[PDB]
Amino acid sequence: IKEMPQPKTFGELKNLPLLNTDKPVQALMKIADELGEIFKFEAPGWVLRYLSSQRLIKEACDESRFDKNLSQVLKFVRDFAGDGLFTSWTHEKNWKKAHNILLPSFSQQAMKGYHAMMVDIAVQLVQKWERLNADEHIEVPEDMTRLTLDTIGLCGFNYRFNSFYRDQPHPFITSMVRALDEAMNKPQRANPDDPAYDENKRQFQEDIKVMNDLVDKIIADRKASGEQSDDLLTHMLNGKDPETGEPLDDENIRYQIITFLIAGHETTSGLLSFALYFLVKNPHVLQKAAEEAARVLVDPVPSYKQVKQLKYVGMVLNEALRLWPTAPAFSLYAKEDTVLGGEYPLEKGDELMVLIPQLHRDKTIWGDDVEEFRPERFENPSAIPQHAFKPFGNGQRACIGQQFALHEATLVLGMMLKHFDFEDHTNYELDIKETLTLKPEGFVVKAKSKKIPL
Template identity: 30%
Template sequence: MYTAEVPRGPKGHFIVGSLPEISRDVLTFFTESARKYGDIFRFSFGPFPAIMINHPDLIAEVLVTQQPNFVKSSVYRRGLRFLGNGLLNSEGQFWQRQRRLVQPAFHLERIAAYADVMVSYTNELLEQWQNGEVRDLYQDMMSLTEKIVSKTLFGFDIRNEVSGVQRALDAVMDFNNQLSNQYLLPSWVPTPSNLRYERATQQLNVIVYKIINERRESGKDIGDLLSLLLRVRDEDNGTGMTDRQVRDEVITLLSAGHETTANAMTWTWFLLSQHPQVQAKLHSELKTVLSKRTPTFADIRSLSYTEKVVMEAMRLYPPVWGISRVSLQDCVLGGYNIKAGTTVFISQWVMHRDSRFFENPNVFDPDRWANNFQKKLPTFAYFPFGGGSRICIGKSFAMMEAILLLATIARSWSLTLQPDHPVVLQPSLTLRPKYGLKMQLIKI
């Protein structure tokens, strides 16, 4: 039983809808609108009709129950066009095939073998640190996770290419930070943002195609994901993946595989610096479990509080703060008729701070995750890795990496935020600190 009425929502402006408010502060817009209008509300991006859903049951409808009717929008893919037709952008049978192909690289026995690389690269970073030094932890985490994912998944050492890859990804994120780039201006219009985006894509192409060509010429199979992508054959016609297909998957996993973890770690350091009692409890666990040695994969099960710190940091500062889908056909959501072509927004930022599911939702409290708290929550009250069939393929990889990096660093270092450093949220495709994160290193 449903009503033909559309949901309530902010009136917006003539022609541009709610774009000005969203462009000014999208997190505040979504948070305040959810508080005012409830579990579902309508708004618009100029001529594009949209709704936002703010209840686990409704999110489950979109990502699970009615999932075939909700796909990535052309606008979303425009913002991520540098990824080509990789896992994040592809749909249908092609996506299913690629997902099956890539999945073995993230099986538990495989990612367990990545642990030593994660810890080793982290120790290399720590060898550069000096007691009392002030560093941008955001840049350190970006560089570190980029090296880790390139080595573990693709078997190459990207140290000489890190700055180039990072500049290119920064250009992409800056483009997506302005919603007008996605919703109002076609990608072929030669604006400064579009031109910078295209240059960034070309820069990534040069780096990735060089890696692909070198591996094809060597003919080596070293058992990594890149080897798998190059040797796979289609079951129907026996053809392999083109260089373009390999390139799309490499750039997708390289970008997503380091960007989200780096942001999760960055916000974890920020929160720890603001909560010395949590930092002290973390150090106590690391001293008890590890003493003076570095962590291994076998230690993860014993680092329960370390894991809770990561989970709580991702609750308050989810690396992916929101996702969207577009309806292919008319449907019903929350008792309302939703027209085909409507964009549906879902925000981890909003849901993770909902007082219906989290007591004192704005407080950083890792102990809230004790006693299997997550199992008591509705599935989509806490979903930093998305959900449904398109849940992040690297979820286990990312959690293991975050725990090991946090343990390796925090066992011997305490980090203090510089008092004059501005901490400003930049909600692009991921949730970045706009001005980085300048912190002082204190050896413990």
């Protein structure tokens, strides 16, 4: 039985001021680097144990001992995402109900049906870049976010955000981004009732209204039409949970749509942005991926089968998730009193946070060269130990969108590599901005068209 390390304290605020930063996950990674595989983090309101080693994270991933927890941030995201799949407790009826209804809509087999509207958006990205003038550059995370938001809008509810027609975000997105920012900031506040936060609280209620009104109208408009589209909203209006026999009600459908739009905006766009960052920084890898794209994508429009054939592009995406898993943490709670790693006693209800970027740098698993971008780590995927690579979370509370995100990312990265050469014209210095997710802020490239028609 060992005493766990604890970072520096600030008197009665304990560790909480360590999160008073725009880059809290990067701060926690440096604390993990100093303290090791586990540390305690105390705040006036709560305690977290942060895990970084495969040894301890493999135990935390045992669903008989530990279940998904909502962190303080997810409890505040729940003020707009409600009991949607991401912000529900496993024991809430609406979690298993929505899980059983939506799993078949997110299968690899379902991707065949979404492929054509993913291509619609991907072609809009390629056409944008083909139409840039010689002196111009690409704002990478900006354009990837236009793409990924628009893809989930169209595949999810046949709604076109038309992000490539805009500089200023859609008003729905203005409100969602500002609501996410308020949720992430509320926990680092020592006096949340201070009157200096009154305008923040008023703005938060307004943003929740903007989101509820567009989404509630989208649902009500589809119910009125009877239109049977190939989309998640049709699936949710018609579906019945095989276990309870119940359909989702309209409130819970709104929370799922809000949840999917948060995911589409925040996650896949980060993955694509980090993948392009690693490619321009590692030109031999770029050339392997470009060669595969040229060999495989032989038609003007990629097919579903051709995307599945892009093995090396998939290895690039997995190695970007290893170094910078764009959703970088998930929380668990102890179901009962238990001892972690034969050393750290936990009480029923004790909260854990998995630092996925630190798990993915465990030298006992990956070797000493963990900071190197090497897609070949994923060439023979059964070689990775159980619970060593967790960019989509764990068990029954793993990402439902994993096959959607990887199909879209593989399609788009394959098309980008088929159509363009890329230049890191600024020798860009990685700067990682943190929202719900990680993205490379200020990342710009120049593209040179290969002049290959669509």
